[PDB]
Design a protein around this ligand. Structure first.
Ligand code: ATP
Ligand code: ADP
Ligand code: ADP
Ligand code: ADP
Ligand code: MG
Ligand code: MG
Lengths: 100, 50, 100, 1622, 50
C-alpha cells in the first residue's frame, strides 16, 4: 500500500535534477535500465527502478554491476521495492535501506 | 581442474577442459572468491575447494 | 421426537450453525408464511433476556451465544462499555409487520 | 435397376455440369457458385454411399466405386481451389492498387508476380474447358493448387509489416486481424466484401449503406436494422483509397449524428414542459430518430427543464415548478407504459424500453430533488447528477452537447452505437458514474472491483455509451504482455476509444508493473489535452508508446474491472494502483433492476413481481442445498427477467393466434388485463433453474414457488414433434427412449431441458458424474434438431486440458509478434469466416473435459453478453448466433463463480442413466451389429436371447454390481468400467462360439450347448469384471455371493473359489489348475526374461488379458512393482499375432509429446476423404502402446493429468487434434495398455473416472509363498542340473531363497526408505546370478553353492541399505536362513564373512581372497594412473567391494548403476577405473553455464551412435549436478528403460542414423535393409552396449522426489549405497 | 431428518435438513479419518498418500 517512487520524483523536482524512471518487469525494461544506468554514471543523472523485487535474479547481476563501477559523484540510483524476502541479501548489504 | 584429473601420457600432462585438452603447466593455481557470506554451496563444490 | 413444530421452540446457538444467515432467513420466512406476508414486510426486533428459558412467542425465536462487543445490555438497553466482550444470555428475535 | 438409374443420372450430371465463371476486372474469369458445386458433390457422394447398403450394389459396384473416387477427387481439388482464389483475390488487390509496396517489398512482389502468372495461366486453361471433368483431368492440377495455396500463404505471412504501416493510417485497423485487414485492403474496389468487417472497427456500425453503383456511401446501418443517412454522402470515386474514405465515413457519421441530435432536440423540446402528450406524435418522434438520439434528447430535455425550474426557484421561498417537471415525466412515462402494454415493432419496442428506463431514473432524481427542497442550481445534489446542456448556437456541431457530472465535463463522442441494452440506473450505478467521471476529469483510469456478477464491465460500458464513446472490452489473461498491451494502447489512443480490461489482475505482476509506465505516459498526454494554454491549432498531442510517438485523442480512457477476492490473482503494484480510481461494487440493487425491467417489458404487476422474484432468488440461494454448479446471482435473475419478457410476448402472440381461429375480437388491452404474469415468471424460473437442480432440490424449489407464488402452477409444453424425432434417433442409435416414469424418461426429460437451455443461453454446461448419459443426450439432441428443423448440426469436441493453453487459444510470437491460432480460436474463426457455409448450420462447440479457471476464464467475454473472444493481438471475434459453447464435465469443484454464473446449467444425476438402459443398449447392439465385421450375427442373437433374463431389473448382474460396490478395489469402482469389461468379455464369448463353429464345420454348436456355455461364461465374466481389479479375498467374496444368488450351475468343489475355474467351450466348468502343468525348464534359459512358470494366477491373468486385448479394448494392469504385470502382458501378447507392442515409460513430467513422438516413429498420417488417419507403418498390424507408469505424470493444481486426458480423448473419440494445423486425426489399429502401481503408493495419483470407464483394470498382486516356491523351485531344478551332485538341493535352496526374500520384504519397506522395494525380480536376479556362477563349473561342493547363494543375497539385498544396523541384520539373517535350510555343512567354508567373488584372477567367476584381490587392484591401478587418470587412490576394503559390485553391473546387459553417496567419495573415479578394467569408454557430458537441453540431446545422439552403430561399450557416467533441467531426466528415463529415445533422432539426424546403422549391421553379418529392422537392431545394440552410471548425494526428500521424477532409475538400475566413508 | 409432504413446506425444516445433512457427512468423514489414523498408529493398516 505504500510506494516511495513519488518521493523520489518530488525530490528530483526540488533538486532540479533530471531522472529516468523505469519499471523493471519487462525485458525491454531491463534493457532500458542498463542503458539508463550506463548513461547516468557518466553524467550525474538520476536513475529510478521501480518494483525491483519482481526480478531478483536480475537484481543480483545489478548488484555485481554496481560493485565494479566508479560513477559521477552526482549519480544516484534508486531501487523501489516491496518488503520481500526474495530480494537478494547482497543487494541489501550493498545499498542503504529506507523503510516506508 | 578442481579434481586435478590430469592425464600423463607421451611425456605430456593434459587437463581436459570442456571438449578440448590443454597442456597443464605445474605453476598454475586458481583462487575462487565471493563477496556474499550467506551464499550456500552445493556439497559437490564444497568437496573440491578449501 | 415431536415433529417439525419442535424446531421453532428450541434455542439455537447461531455460532454453532454452519450457515446462520440461512437460519435468520428461515425464521423470517416462517413468520411471513404464518401471517401470509412478504419477507420485505417484516422487520426484526431484538429482546435481550436476563436469563435463558423464557416465554417464546409464536413469532419469536431464541438465540444463544451472541457476544456484545463494546457495549453492555441491561433491560434491552445498550450503554457504552470499556469491556471487550459481554455475554448476551438469550436473544429473542421477533419478526413483526414493518410500520416504516 | 434403380441403382443403374442413379449411376446414369450422376453421369449425365457430370457430363454437362460446368463450373460457372465470371469476369474479374478484365483480368481473368474466376469461379463462383461454390455452394451449388459442393452440395452436388456431397449429395452424389451420399447417394453412392447409400446404394452400397442395397443388396443389388455388387453388379454396379465397380462403376459406383469409380464415381466415388472421382467425386472425392473433385471434393479435393475445389476444396483447395476456393481458398487459393479467395487469397489470390485480395493479394492481387494489394499488389496492384499500391505501387509503394513494390519498392517496399521487392522479393515478395516478384514471388507474387510468378504466383499470379501461374494462377492466370491456370485461369485461361479453365476458361477454355469450363467442364468440371476436364478441369479435374488437367495434368497435375491438384498439386498445382496445393503449391499455389502454400505460396499464397507464405506471401500472406510476409505482408505483416505492410499491414502494420497500413494500420498506422486508419487506427481502427489496429482492432482487425491480419487476414481480415488484407481482405479489406485487397478488396477496396469490391466494397460488399467489406461489410462483414465493420462490426470489428465500429461500436454499432454493422454495415454501410451503398448506392446502386456501390461508389457512394449514403449511410450506415446497425445489426438490428437501424439506419442512419449521411447528411452529405461520401464519394468513394472522389477518394478511392480505402483508409481515406473510411475516415470520411467515420467523420460524416459523427457529424450526421450531431445534426440529427440538433433536430431531435428542437422537436423533443415541445414534448417537454407540456401538460399533455399525444401518443401519435410521441411515437412518430421516437420512430423518426435513432434510439441513441431519442434517449439522448430525452435526457437533455429533462436536464434543461430541471435547470429552468431551479433557476426560477432562486428566491428560496418561491413556488416550486420542480413539481411540473415531475408531472411532465409522469405523463411521458404513462404514455410509454401504455405503448409497451400493446404490441409494437421490435425496434420501436426497444426504444420504448430504453425511454422507460431513462425516465424512471429521471422520476427518481426529481423526486429526490423535490423531497430535499432543492432550489439552487449550484447545489451539489443537482451537480452530482449527470446533466446535459445543449447549445444550438455553437458553431461546431460536435460541441453543441456537453455532459456534466459534479465538476467533470465531457463532450459527446457521437460514435454510432446502434441499439444496445441499457442498464437500470441504480444508486450503485449512480455512484459508479460519479466515481468514474471524477477519475476521468482527473485523467485517471477507472477501477470497479468486486465479486463476479455485480455489473462492473456493464457499468463501464454503459458509462462509455452514455458519453457516446467507443468502448472495447478485453478479456485479459497472462498472455497480455507489455508489447501486446502497448499495441492495444496505441490503437485506442489513436482511435480515441475506451479500453475496458476485465480480469486485469490475471496478468503477471511484472507485466502489470511494465504496463504502468505506458498508462502513466498516456495519462500525461490526456493532461496536456486538458491544459487550456494548449491550443487546438498547434502540434497534435502525442505520447511515447512502444518507442514510437503516438497521437493521443482526448476522448480515450482506460478502465480495469477485477475481483480481488479470487486467490491466485496477481497483486497490483502500488505505482499502478495510484494511476486508477477504485470503486467497490459488491451489492447491486436487484429489486430496482427487476422492477424497472418488468415495468419496461409491459408487466402491469411489475412491483409485486419484483418483490416476489428477488427474495425468491435469495431463498433459492439459502434454502436449497449447496452445489458447485448453483448460481442465483444477478446474471441468473437477469436471464430469468429477459426470458419472462420473451414468454410474455410469445403468450400474447399465442392468444391472438387462438383468437384468429375463434372469432375476431382481438383487443390488446383485454389481453393485457387478463394475462397470467405470475405464471409467465414461474415458467421462466422453471425453464432456467430446474435443469441445474439435483433430485432432492426439485420439491424444495416447488415448495418455495408455492410459498412465494401461491396458486400458480407450472406445466411444461408437450413438445411432441421433438419427442418423436428423439424417439427415432434413439431407435437408430440403439438408445432407450422413455416418456415420464418409463425407462429412460428421466434422460429424455434432461434432453428436453438441454434443448430449452440451448434456446436461452449461448453458453451452457451439462454437469454430472461420469456415465450420466450426457454425451448421448447432446448428440441425440443435435441429430433430432437436424431432422426436425432441416438445419445441419456440426459438433466440434475439444478436450481443453488434453493440450496446452497456448495450443487451445493461440500464441503471440515474442519476436515477430505473429499470431498463431489455437484450436478453439481456429474453429471459431472458421465458423465466422463461413467459407463453406458454416454460418448456415448449427454449430456446437463442446468442451469435453475438466474445467479450471486458467483456461475457461478466457471465455468470460464469450459466455457473457459481449459474445466476444478477445485475443492479445487486439483482435476480437464475435460469436455468431448459430454457435453454442458447451462444456461436458463431470464436476465443477475448481470452476469459479464467474464461469458458473456465465452459463446455463443442466444437471445429470447417476439416476438419469439407469442400468437397465445400459443393458438394453448393449443387447440391442449385440442383436443388430455383427462382431465379425450372418452366422456370426445369428450367434450373437442367440446369445442375447440366452442372456436377456439375467440382464433385467434386479437381476443377476445388477445384484452382483451392487454387492461389488461394497467390496474394496485397488482403484475406485464405477459402473461403466465393470459393464464395459463384461460386455467385451461377452463379445469374446460370442467370438469363441463362432470359432468353435469354424473348428466344426460339420456339427455347429447347438442351442443347448450354447446356453450351457453362455450362462457359465456370464458368471465367469461377471466375476472377472467386478472383482478382477481386487485382491483374492474379495474375489472369493463376490464368488460366494454369486453362488448364493445365482441359478446358473456352478462347480461343486467345497473350498475352491469359482474364480479358479474357466468355462470350456463345451459349456462345462473346468478348473484352471488343469492348464498349470509342472514344467521342467531347459537349463540354458533358467530365469530368462522371457521364460514364465505356469501358475493359477498366470493362466487366469493371461486368459483375461487375451480376452480384453483381442477386442482392442484399452486396459490397465495394476499391482506392486515386480508383481509380473509386464510379464503377464507380454505372455498374453505372445498368443496374439499381428500385434506389435511399443513400450513407453511414464514419469511425473510425461506429457502427450511422448505419445506423439512414438506415433511419429511407428505410425504415419495419411489424407483420406474422411480426414487424417494415423495408422501404424506396418500394414495388417495392430499396435499396442504399453504405458508402464500411467498414473505417475504430474497432476496439476486442478486435479488434471494432461496425458490421461489425452489418452481418454483418443480412447473415447477415436482420435485427437494435430496442433500444427488444428486438424482432427483419427486413430486406426492402435490400442492402449497401461501398467501402474496402486494409487496409494507415493507419487501415484488416482486415475480419472472418465478415463476408468473405458479401461478395465486387472489387479496383479505378488505371487504367494506357494507360487513363489513353485516358480523358483522349477528355476532351481533347471539350474542345478549343471551339477548333478547338487540335485537333491533343489528344494532347500529355493525354500531358503523364499524365506530370506520374505523376511527381507517384511524387514524393509517404503516407509523407511523410498527404494526399499523387494519383489520376485530380486528372486529372478538371485536365480540368474547363481546360475551364471555355476555354468563353467564342472563340480562344486554344497558349501560352495551356499557361498554363491549368500554372495548373491548380499549383492541383491544388502547393497541398497542405508543404515549399518540394516546391513548387520541382513548379514546375520543370511547366516540364519542358510543354517536353517542347510544343516550338516561346515559353517566357516560357506559363511566366511568377507564373501568376495571375481573373474579378475581366473577365467571363471569364483571366490577370491581379499589380499590377492588387493594386490591385483593395486597392480591394475598402477597402470590406470599412467593410461587414463593420474589420481592416486588410497585402497581400503570398501573400495574393493565397491569395484567388485561395479564390475558385476558392467558385465550385465542394460547394466545401469545408481551410486548414492557423499561427494568426494570416489564414486566417479571408481566407476571410470572399473570401466577401464572392462574395456568401456567413459563418457561424461561437459556441463557449462550455457549448457541446454539441445546440448544434452546432441550428447545423447553422439553416445547412442557410438554404442548402437559402432558396437562400442560405453559407460555413460553422469551426476545429479549434470541435470540442469527435468527434460534431461525425461530423456534418461526412456533411455534407461528401453534403450531408445522416440524423438531423439529426427530429420537429417534420423537419415544419418539409418546410414550408420546400415553400415554397422553389414559389418556384423546381418541382412537388414528396412528402417524398422535397422532401428530395432540399433536399439538392441544400445541395450547390450550402453551402461549408465548415475551418481547422486544422499537426500531423503531428494531421493523420494527422484523416484517419481525418474522411476526407471529405481527399477532398471542397480542401486548401491556407498554413502559416506565409515 | 425425515422428509414429509408437510415438512417440505416449512422453511425451518428445510434449513435444519441442510444443516443436519452436511453435519452428518462431515461427522462421518472426520470419524473415519481419525479411526484410520488410530489404526495406522497401531501398525495395523498401511499408510496411503492421503
Ligand atoms: N437413452 C439411453 N438408453 C440406453 N443407453 C443409453 C442411453 N443414452 C446413453 N446410453 C448409453 O449409456 C452410456 C452413456 O454414455 P454417455 O457418453 O452418454 O455418458 P456421459 O455421462 O456423457 O459420459 P462421460 O461423463 O464419460 O462424458 C453409453 O454406453 C451409451 O451408449
Ligand atoms: N444497472 C443494471 N441494470 C441491469 N442489469 C444490470 C445492471 N448492472 C449489472 N447488470 C447485469 O448484471 C450482470 C453482470 O454484469 P457484469 O458487468 O458482467 O458484472 P461483473 O463485471 O461484476 O461480473 C449482467 O447480466 C448485467 O446486464
Ligand atoms: N510364473 C512366473 N514365471 C516366471 N517369473 C515369474 C513368474 N511370476 C512372477 N515372476 C517374476 O516376477 C517378476 C515380475 O517382474 P515384472 O514383469 O517387471 O513385474 P511388474 O510388471 O509387476 O513390474 C520377475 O522377476 C519374474 O521373473
Ligand atoms: N579412494 C580414494 N582415494 C583417494 N582419493 C579419493 C578416493 N575417493 C575419493 N577421493 C577423492 O575424491 C575426489 C573426487 O573423486 P570422485 O570419483 O569424483 O568422487 P565422487 O564420485 O564421490 O564425487 C578425488 O580426486 C580424490 O581427491
Ligand atoms: Mg465483468
Ligand atoms: Mg461423455
Amino acid at each position: 500500500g505504500y510506494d516511495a517512487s513519488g518521493h523520489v520524483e518530488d525530490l528530483a523536482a526540488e533538486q532540479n535534477t533530471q531522472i529516468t524512471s523505469i519499471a523493471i518487469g519487462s525485458a525491454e525494461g531491463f534493457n532500458q535500465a542498463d542503458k539508463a544506468i550506463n548513461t547516468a554514471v557518466k553524467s550525474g543523472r538520476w536513475v529510478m527502478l521501480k518494483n525491483v523485487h519482481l526480478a531478483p535474479g536480475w537484481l543480483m547481476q545489478l548488484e555485481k554491476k554496481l560493485h565494479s563501477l566508479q560513477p559521477h559523484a552526482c549519480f544516484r540510483l534508486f531501487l523501489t521495492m516491496e518488503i520481500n524476502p526474495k530480494v537478494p541479501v547482497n543487494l541489501l548489504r550493498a545499498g542503504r535501506i529506507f523503510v516506508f | 581442474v578442481l579434481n586435478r584429473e590430469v592425464r600423463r601420457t607421451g611425456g605430456r600432462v593434459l587437463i581436459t577442459l570442456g571438449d578440448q585438452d590443454i597442456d597443464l603447466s605445474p605453476s598454475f593455481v586458481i583462487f575462487l572468491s565471493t563477496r556474499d557470506p550467506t551464499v550456500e554451496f552445493p556439497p559437490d563444490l564444497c568437496s573440491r575447494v578449501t | 421426537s415431536g415433529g417439525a413444530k419442535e424446531l421453532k421452540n428450541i434455542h439455537v446457538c447461531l455460532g454453532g450453525l454452519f450457515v446462520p444467515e440461512a437460519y435468520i432467513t428461515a425464521t423470517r420466512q416462517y413468520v411471513a408464511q404464518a401471517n401470509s406476508w412478504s419477507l420485505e414486510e417484516l422487520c426484526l426486533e431484538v429482546n435481550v433476556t436476563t436469563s435463558q428459558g423464557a416465554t417464546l412467542d409464536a413469532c419469536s425465536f431464541g438465540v444463544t451465544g451472541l457476544k456484545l462487543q463494546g457495549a453492555t445490555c441491561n433491560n434491552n438497553k445498550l450503554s457504552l462499555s470499556n469491556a471487550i466482550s459481554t455475554a448476551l444470555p438469550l436473544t429473542q428475535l421477533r419478526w413483526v409487520k414493518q410500520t416504516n | 435397376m434403380a441403382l443403374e438409374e442413379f449411376l446414369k443420372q450422376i453421369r449425365e450430371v457430370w457430363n454437362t455440369y460446368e463450373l460457372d465463371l465470371v469476369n474479374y476486372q478484365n483480368k481473368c474469369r474466376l469461379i463462383r457458385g461454390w455452394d451449388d458445386l459442393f452440395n452436388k458433390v456431397k449429395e452424389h457422394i451420399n447417394s453412392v454411399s447409400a446404394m452400397k447398403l442395397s443388396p443389388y450394389y455388387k453388379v454396379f459396384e465397380e462403376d459406383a466405386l469409380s464415381w466415388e473416387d472421382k467425386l472425392n477427387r473433385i471434393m479435393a481439388l475445389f476444396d483447395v481451389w476456393i481458398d487459393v482464389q479467395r487469397r489470390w483475390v485480395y493479394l492481387e488487390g494489394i499488389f496492384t492498387g499500391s505501387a509503394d509496396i513494390k519498392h517496399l517489398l521487392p522479393v515478395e512482389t516478384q514471388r507474387f508476380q510468378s504466383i499470379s502468372t501461374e494462377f492466370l495461366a491456370l485461369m485461361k486453361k479453365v476458361s477454355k474447358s469450363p467442364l468440371v471433368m476436364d478441369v479435374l483431368n488437367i495434368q497435375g492440377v491438384q498439386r498445382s493448387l496445393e503449391r499455389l495455396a502454400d505460396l499464397l500463404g507464405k506471401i500472406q505471412k510476409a505482408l505483416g509489416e505492410y499491414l502494420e504501416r497500413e494500420r498506422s493510417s486508419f487506427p481502427r485497423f489496429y482492432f482487425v486481424g491480419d487476414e481480415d485487414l488484407l481482405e479489406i485492403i485487397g478488396n477496396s474496389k469490391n466494397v460488399a466484401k467489406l461489410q462483414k468487417h465493420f462490426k470489428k472497427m465500429f461500436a454499432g456500425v454493422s454495415s454501410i449503406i451503398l448506392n446502386e453503383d456501390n461508389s457512394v456511401v449514403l449511410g450506415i446501418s446497425s445489426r438490428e436494422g437501424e439506419e442512419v443517412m449521411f447528411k452529405t454522402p461520401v464519394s468513394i470515386t472522389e477518394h478511392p483509397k480505402i483508409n481515406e474514405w473510411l475516415t470520411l465515413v467515420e467523420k460524416e457519421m459523427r457529424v450526421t449524428l450531431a445534426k440529427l441530435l440538433a433536430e431531435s432536440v428542437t422537436e423533443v423540446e415541445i414534448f417537454g414542459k407540456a401538460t399533455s402528450i399525444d401518443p401519435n406524435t410521441y411515437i412518430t418522434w421516437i420512430d423518426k430518430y435513432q434510439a441513441q438520439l431519442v434517449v439522448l434528447s430525452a435526457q437533455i430535455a429533462w436536464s434543461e427543464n430541471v435547470e429552468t425550474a431551479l433557476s426560477s426557484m432562486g428566491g428560496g421561498g418561491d413556488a416550486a415548478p420542480l413539481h411540473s417537471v415531475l408531472s411532465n415525466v409522469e405523463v411521458t412515462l404513462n404514455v410509454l407504459a401504455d405503448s409497451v402494454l400493446m404490441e409494437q415493432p421490435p425496434l420501436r419496442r426497444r426504444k420504448l424500453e430504453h425511454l422507460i428506463t431513462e425516465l424512471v431514473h429521471q422520476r427518481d432524481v426529481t423526486r429526490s430533488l423535490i423531497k430535499s427542497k432543492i432550489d439552487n442550481a449550484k447545489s451539489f445534489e443537482w451537480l452530482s447528477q449527470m446533466r446535459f446542456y445543449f447549445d444550438p448556437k455553437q458553431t461546431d456541431v460536435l460541441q453543441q452537447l456537453s455532459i456534466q457530472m459534479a465538476n467533470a465535463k465531457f463532450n459527446y463522442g457521437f460514435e454510432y452505437l446502434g441499439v444496445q441494452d441499457k442498464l437500470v440506473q441504480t444508486p450503485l450505478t449512480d455512484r459508479c458514474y460519479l466515481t468514474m467521471t471524477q477519475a476521468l476529469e482527473a485523467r485517471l483510469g477507472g477501477s470497479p472491483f468486486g465479486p463476479a456478477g455485480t455489473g462492473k464491465t456493464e457499468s463501464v460500458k454503459a458509462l462509455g455509451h452514455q458519453l457516446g464513446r467507443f468502448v472495447l472490452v478485453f478479456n485479459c489473461d497472462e498472455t497480455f504482455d507489455f508489447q501486446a498491451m502497448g499495441r492495444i494502447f496505441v490503437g485506442l489512443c489513436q482511435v480515441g476509444a475506451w479500453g475496458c480490461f476485465d480480469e486485469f489482475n490475471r496478468l503477471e505482476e511484472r507485466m502489470l508493473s511494465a504496463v504502468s509506465q505506458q498508462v502513466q505516459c498516456i495519462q500525461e498526454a490526456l493532461r496536456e489535452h486538458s491544459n487550456p494554454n494548449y491550443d487546438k491549432t498547434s502540434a497534435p498531442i502525442t505520447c511515447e508508446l512502444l518507442n514510437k510517438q503516438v497521437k493521443v485523442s482526448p476522448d480515450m480512457a482506460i478502465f480495469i474491472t477485477m475481483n480481488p477476492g479470487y486467490a491466485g490473482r496477481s497483486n497490483l503494484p502500488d505505482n499502478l494502483k495510484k494511476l486508477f480510481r477504485s470503486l467497490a461494487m459488491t451489492k447491486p440493487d436487484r429489486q430496482l433492476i427487476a422492477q424497472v425491467m418488468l415495468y419496461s417489458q409491459g408487466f402491469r404487476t411489475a412491483e409485486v413481481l419484483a418483490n416476489k422474484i428477488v427474495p425468491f432468488f435469495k431463498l433459492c440461494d439459502e434454502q436449497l442445498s449447496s452445489q458447485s454448479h448453483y448460481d442465483f446471482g444477478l446474471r441468473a435473475l437477469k436471464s430469468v427477467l429477459v426470458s419472462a419478457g420473451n414468454v410474455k410476448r410469445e403468450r400474447i402472440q399465442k392468444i391472438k393466434r387462438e383468437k384468429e381461429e375463434r372469432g375476431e375480437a382481438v383487443d390488446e388491452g383485454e389481453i393485457a388485463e387478463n394475462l397470467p404474469e405470475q405464471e409467465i415468471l414461474i415458467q421462466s424460473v422453471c425453464e432456467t433453474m430446474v435443469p441445474k437442480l439435483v433430485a432432492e432440490d426439485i420439491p424444495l424449489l416447488f415448495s418455495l414457488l408455492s410459498d412465494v407464488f401461491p396458486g400458480v402452477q407450472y406445466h411444461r409444453g408437450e413438445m411432441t414433434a421433438l419427442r418423436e424425432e428423439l424417439k427415432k434417433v434413439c431407435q437408430e442409435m440403439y438408445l432407450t427412449y422413455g416418456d415420464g416414469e418409463e425407462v429412460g424418461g428421466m434422460w429424455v426429460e434432461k434432453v428436453l431441458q438441454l434443448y430449452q437451455i440451448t434456446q436461452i443461453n449461448h453458453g451452457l454446461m451439462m454437469v454430472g458424474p461420469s456415465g450420466s448419459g450426457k454425451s448421448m443426450a447432446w448428440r441425440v439432441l443435435l441429430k433430432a434438431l437436424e431432422r426436425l428443423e432441416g438445419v445441419e448440426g456440426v459438433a466440434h469436441i475439444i478436450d481443453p486440458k488434453a493440450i496446452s493453453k497456448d495450443h487451445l487459444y493461440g500464441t503471440l510470437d515474442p519476436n515477430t509478434r505473429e499470431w498463431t491460432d489455437g484450436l478453439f480460436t481456429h474453429v471459431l474463426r472458421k465458423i465466422i469466416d463461413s467459407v463453406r457455409g458454416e454460418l448456415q448450420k448449427r454449430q456446437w462447440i463442446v468442451f469435453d473435459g475438466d474445467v479450471d479457471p486458467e483456461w475457461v476464464e478466457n471465455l468470460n467475454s464469450v459466455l457473457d453478453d459481449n459474445k466476444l473472444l478477445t485475443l492479445p493481438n487486439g483482435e476480437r471475434l464475435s460469436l455468431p448466433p448459430n454457435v453454442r459453447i458447451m462444456f461436458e464435465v463431470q464436476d465443477l469443484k475448481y470452476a469459479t463463480l464467474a464461469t458458473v454464473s456465465r452459463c446455463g446449467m443442466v444437471w445429470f444425476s447417476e439416476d438419469v442413466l439407469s442400468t437397465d438402459m445400459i443393458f438394453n443398449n448393449f443387447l440391442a447392439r449385440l442383436r443388430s451389429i455383427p462382431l465379425d465385421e450372418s452366422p456370426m450375427l445369428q450367434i450373437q442373437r442367440d446369445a442375447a436371447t440366452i442372456m436377456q433374463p439375467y440382464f433385467t431389473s434386479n437381476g443377476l448382474v445388477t445384484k452382483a454390481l451392487e454387492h461389488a460396490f461394497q467390496l474394496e478395489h485397488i482403484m475406485d469402482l464405477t459402473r461403466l468400467r465393470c459393464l464395459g469389461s463384461l460386455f467385451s468379455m461377452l463379445h469374446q464369448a460370442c467370438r469363441n462360439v463362432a470359432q468353435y463353429n469354424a473348428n466344426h464345420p460339420d456339427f455347429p454348436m447347438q442351442i443347448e450347448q450354447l446356453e450351457r456355455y453362455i450362462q457359465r461364461y456370464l458368471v465367469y465374466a461377471i466375476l472377472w469384471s467386478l472383482s478382477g481389479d481386487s485382491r483374492l479375498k474379495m474375489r472369493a467374496e463376490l464368488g460366494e455371493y454369486i453362488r448364493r444368488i445365482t441359478t446358473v450351475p456352478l462347480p461343486t468343489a467345497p473350498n475352491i473359489p469359482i474364480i479358479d475355474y474357466e468355462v470350456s467351450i463345451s459349456g462345462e466348468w473346468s478348473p484352471w489348475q488343469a492348464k498349470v502343468p509342472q514344467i521342467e525348464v531347459e537349463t540354458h534359459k533358467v530365469a530368462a526374461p522371457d521364460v514364465v512358470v505356469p501358475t493359477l494366477d498366470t493362466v487366469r491373468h493371461e486368459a483375461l488379458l487375451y480376452t480384453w486385448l483381442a477386442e482392442h479394448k484399452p486396459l490397465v494392469l495394476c499391482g506392486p512393482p515386480g508383481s509380473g504385470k509386464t510379464m503377464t502382458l507380454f505372455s498374453a501378447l505372445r498368443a496374439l499375432p499381428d500385434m506389435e507392442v511399443v513400450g513407453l515409460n511414464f514419469s511425473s513430467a510425461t506429457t502427450p509429446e511422448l505419445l506423439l513422438k512414438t506415433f511419429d516413429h511407428y505410425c504415419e498420417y495419411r489424407r483420406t476423404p474422411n480426414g487424417v488417419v494415423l495408422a501404424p507403418v506396418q500394414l495388417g498390424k495392430w499396435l499396442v502402446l504399453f504405458c508402464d507408469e500411467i498414473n505417475l505424470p504430474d497432476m496439476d493444481k486442478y486435479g488434471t493429468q494432461r496425458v490421461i486426458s489425452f489418452i481418454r480423448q483418443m480412447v473415447e473419440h477415436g482420435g485427437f487434434y494435430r496442433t500444427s494445423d488444428q486438424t482432427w486425426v483419427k486413430l486406426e489399429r492402435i490400442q492402449f495398455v497401461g501398467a501402474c502401481n496402486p494409487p496409494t503408493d507415493p507419487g501415484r495419483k488416482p486415475l480419472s473416472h472418465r478415463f476408468l470407464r473405458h479401461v478395465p483394470v486387472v489387479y496383479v498382486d505378488y505371487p504367494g509363498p506357494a507360487s513363489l516356491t513353485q516358480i523358483y523351485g522349477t528355476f532351481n531344478r533347471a539350474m542345478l542340473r549343471l551339477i548333478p551332485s547338487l540335485r537333491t538341493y533343489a528344494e532347500p535352496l529355493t525354500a531358503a531363497m523364499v524365506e530370506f526374500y520374505t523376511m527381507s520384504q517384511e524387514r524393509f519397506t517404503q516407509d523407511t526408505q523410498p527404494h526399499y522395494i523387494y519383489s520376485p525380480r530380486e528372486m529372478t536376479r538371485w536365480v540368474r546370478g547363481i546360475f551364471e556362477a555355476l555354468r563353467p563349473l564342472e563340480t562344486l561342493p554344497v558349501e560352495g553353492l551356499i557361498r554363491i547363494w549368500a554372495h548373491e543375497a548380499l549383492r541383491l539385498f544388502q547393497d541398497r541399505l542405508v543404515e549399518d544396523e540394516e546391513r548387520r541384520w541382513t548379514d546375520e539373517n543370511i547366516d540364519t536362513v542358510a543354517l536353517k535350510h542347510f544343516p550338516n555343512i561346515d559353517r566357516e567354508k560357506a559363511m566366511s564373512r568377507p564373501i568376495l567373488y571375481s573373474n579378475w584372477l581366473s577365467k571363471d567367476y569364483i571366490p577370491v581372497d581379499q589380499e590377492e584381490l588387493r594386490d591385483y587392484v593395486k597392480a591394475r591401478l598402477k597402470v590406470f594412473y599412467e593410461e587414463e587418470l593420474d589420481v592416486p587412490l588410497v585402497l581400503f576394503n570398501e573400495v574393493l567391494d565397491h569395484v567388485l559390485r561395479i564390475d558385476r553391473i558392467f558385465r550385465q546387459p542394460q547394466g545401469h548403476l545408481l551410486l548414492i553417496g557423499v561427494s568426494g567419495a570416489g564414486k566417479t573415479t571408481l566407476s571410470r577405473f572399473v570401466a577401464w578394467m572392462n574395456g568401456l569408454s567413459v563418457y561424461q557430458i561437459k556441463v557449462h553455464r550455457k549448457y541446454t537441453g539441445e546440448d544434452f540431446d546432441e550428447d545423447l545422439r553422439t553416445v547412442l551412435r557410438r554404442s548402437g552403430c559402432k558396437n562400442e561399450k560405453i559407460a555413460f557416467i553422469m551426476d545429479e549436478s549434470n541435470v540442469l533441467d527435468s527434460g534431461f531426466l525425461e530423456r534418461m528415463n526412456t533411455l534407461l528403460a528401453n534403450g531408445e529415445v522416440p524423438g531423439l533422432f529426427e530429420g537429417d539426424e534420423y537419415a544419418t542414423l539409418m546410414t550408420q546403422c546400415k553400415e554397422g549391421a553389414q559389418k556384423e553379418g546381418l541382412m537388414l535393409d528396412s528402417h524398422e529392422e535397422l532401428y530395432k537392431w540399433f536399439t538392441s545394440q544400445v541395450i547390450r552396449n550402453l551402461h549408465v552410471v548415475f551418481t547422486m548425494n544422499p537426500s531423503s526428500e531428494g531421493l523420494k522426489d527422484r523416484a517419481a521424477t525418474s522411476p526407471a532409475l529405481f527399477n532398471r538400475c542397480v542401486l548401491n549405497w556407498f554413502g559416506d566413508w565409515s | 431428518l425425515k422428509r414429509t409432504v408437510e415438512n417440505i413446506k416449512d422453511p425451518l425444516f428445510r434449513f435444519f435438513e441442510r444443516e443436519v445433512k452436511m453435519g452428518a457427512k462431515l461427522l462421518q468423514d472426520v470419524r473415519q479419518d481419525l479411526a484410520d489414523v488410530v489404526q495406522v498408529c497401531e501398525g495395523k493398516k498401511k499408510q496411503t498418500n492421503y
